[PDB]
Design an enzyme around this catalytic site. Structure first.
Site, mmCIF file in Angstrom:
data_model
loop_
_atom_site.group_PDB
_atom_site.id
_atom_site.type_symbol
_atom_site.label_atom_id
_atom_site.label_comp_id
_atom_site.label_asym_id
_atom_site.label_seq_id
_atom_site.Cartn_x
_atom_site.Cartn_y
_atom_site.Cartn_z
ATOM 1 N N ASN A 59 0.844 -1.228 0.000
ATOM 2 C CA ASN A 59 0.000 0.000 0.000
ATOM 3 C C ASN A 59 0.870 1.265 0.000
ATOM 4 O O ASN A 59 0.345 2.333 0.366
ATOM 5 C CB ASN A 59 -0.986 0.001 1.175
ATOM 6 C CG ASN A 59 -1.883 -1.214 1.170
ATOM 7 O OD1 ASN A 59 -1.856 -2.004 2.107
ATOM 8 N ND2 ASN A 59 -2.644 -1.404 0.105
ATOM 9 N N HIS A 107 3.253 2.234 1.896
ATOM 10 C CA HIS A 107 3.558 2.729 3.267
ATOM 11 C C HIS A 107 4.903 2.171 3.742
ATOM 12 O O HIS A 107 5.241 1.032 3.371
ATOM 13 C CB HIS A 107 2.408 2.393 4.224
ATOM 14 C CG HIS A 107 1.272 3.350 4.089
ATOM 15 N ND1 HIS A 107 1.214 4.533 4.800
ATOM 16 C CD2 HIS A 107 0.195 3.345 3.277
ATOM 17 C CE1 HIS A 107 0.122 5.191 4.469
ATOM 18 N NE2 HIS A 107 -0.527 4.480 3.539
ATOM 19 N N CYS A 158 6.595 7.845 8.828
ATOM 20 C CA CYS A 158 7.595 8.373 7.875
ATOM 21 C C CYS A 158 6.968 8.308 6.475
ATOM 22 O O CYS A 158 6.383 7.259 6.156
ATOM 23 C CB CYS A 158 8.894 7.587 7.950
ATOM 24 S SG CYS A 158 10.170 8.332 6.907
#
Ligand SMILES: Cc1ccsc1C1=NO[C@@]2(CCCN(Cc3c(F)cccc3F)C2=O)C1
Ligand SMILES: Cc1ccsc1C1=NO[C@@]2(CCCN(Cc3c(F)cccc3F)C2=O)C1
Lengths: 271, 267
Positions: free
Chosen positions: B191, B193, B228
């Protein structure tokens, strides 16, 4: 309880893997890095099963202070396995000319028994003290030739295999570059060396996002020249040469010295 | 051929793993990152086995635009497994106060049935649009509470668990730091991330080489504040309080990504 074993003839080794959630990327399939790691894993288990040992040495190799080093790695994926797919990898070695040994792999979807990928690699002997390429006599060879098929078994049996195509040095400036890449501690193996798979990630960092979004990798060829040291800084360069090909060059930021070079081949994803 | 299944009562999930050559580090045993990845793997398989879904959402969570986020992850390894070792991981979830859910893990050497590790994690629901913590009613909770033990099952049952100790903000300057760390493409999941395991590597980059050469990690506690982002630049700081405090902060703004505690034992 491994489900990883020498074949009956004792001349090749097979191991199955269930692809894990964290092993897949954007395409919902196993990353090139996952594949490379599984090829290495089955190599190491094969080496242990016929009594070699991190460096796959023989008795006489340890005696002459000799170690195997990769000259070339080639991976072809026809289909990336998804999360939950069992893959079976068969691996075996063979004599390669007057200086080299090959390791080959065939990757099958375990469910269908269909080949979804294949890899081959060329290894040379180096004197670990002098870092020189060292040819060895027939008795050193006989120590590992015991455990190789006697008649040619090729993962790449075709006439003029992409697996053997030379890689030229790309012309500066590169179309595309990721600059000042540094190894992390997690990029060192059990012997405090930078892992091959680190170099695949760095190669892939040089690919434009637009290509990653619309294509997946069918082939990767790396020719290794030097090891990256733990505090080395590295530039990953690429240029082009429903299909596209890229040349790759990894060089030290300071000196410009070649770490390795590469070719990737990509296929358009239509869905 | 998974060897990965709900237990008979359907309230916990067990999966076994054979440790691979590439999963071990300098100490000839499975890295912290390997362990973290196996804990996540068994979580995801558990989620799929009782019909959730990448984000472990329920019907009503997707409806209220809610997602699970880790507030705290705590891992204790008593013994790192070697290459070829079979490890068995049992995992289950439990209601945690009025806002929180826990996922616990127990790690056993499959051969001996000896516990070699245990982990626990605290999760909160967040509105994906506003990034705010959102409390939900009892019927939203009942969608996932079905699949949890009703009575206390704790991986950390002890009275004053290290797993619950607060983490203070370390004082600048840090004794130890890795500056200007950037996520690689390979540190993004399915995804797009940054993976938790990226944060464990960055925590470990702050540990002095001298400690890595003479000690291995027994405990890691991370409190997460922010994600992050893929082109964020990060400083990983540490100081002793052997035990170390950890602080991940954005190079630009100085804003906290997360904070941490590690505990080390001499090899
Ligand atoms: C895949 C891998 C990872 C670390 S070293 C290595 C190797 N793959 O191929 C090599 C070179 C050739 C020598 N051997 C030893 C060997 C035989 F020659 C025959 C049968 C089994 C065997 F292990 C390799 O394994 C190194
Ligand atoms: C595994 C995973 C992936 C994305 S978020 C996440 C999580 N792991 O732990 C959590 C916390 C509590 C909610 N759930 C759902 C859940 C039950 F509540 C009970 C049984 C299985 C199950 F999957 C989680 O998994 C979030």
């Amino acid at each position: 309880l491994r489900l990883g074993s020498l074949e009956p003839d004792g001349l090749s080794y097979k191991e199955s893997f269930i692809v894990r959630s964290y092993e897949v990327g954007v395409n919902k399939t196993a990353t090139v890095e996952t594949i490379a790691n599984l090829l290495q894993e089955v190599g190491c288990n094969h080496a242990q099963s016929v009594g070699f040992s991190g460096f796959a040495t023989t008795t006489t190799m340890r005696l002459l202070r000799l170690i195997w080093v990769t000259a070339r790695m080639h991976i072809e994926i026809y289909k990336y396995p998804a999360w939950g797919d069992v893959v079976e990898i068969e691996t075996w070695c063979q004599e390669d000319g007057k200086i080299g040994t090959r390791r080959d792999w065939i990757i099958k979807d375990y469910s269908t028994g269909v080949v979804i990928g294949r890899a081959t690699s060329k290894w040379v002997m180096m004197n670990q003290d002098t870092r020189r390429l060292q040819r060895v006599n027939d008795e050193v060879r006989e120590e590992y030739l015991i455990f190789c098929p006697r008649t040619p078994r090729l993962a790449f049996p075709e006439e003029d295999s992409d697996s053997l195509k030379k890689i030229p040095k790309l012309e500066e400036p590169a179309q595309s570059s990721k600059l000042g890449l540094v190894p992390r501690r997690a990029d060192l193996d059990m012997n405090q060396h930078v892992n091959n798979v680190t170099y695949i990630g760095w190669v892939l960092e040089s690919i434009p996002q637009e290509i990653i979004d619309t294509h997946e990798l069918q082939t990767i060829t790396l020719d290794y020249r030097r090891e990256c040291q733990h505090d080395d800084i590295v530039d990953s360069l690429s240029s082009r040469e429903g299909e596209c090909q890229f040349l790759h060059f990894l060089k030290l930021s300071g000196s410009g010295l070649e770490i390795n070079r590469g070719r990737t081949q990509w296929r358009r994803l239509a869905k």
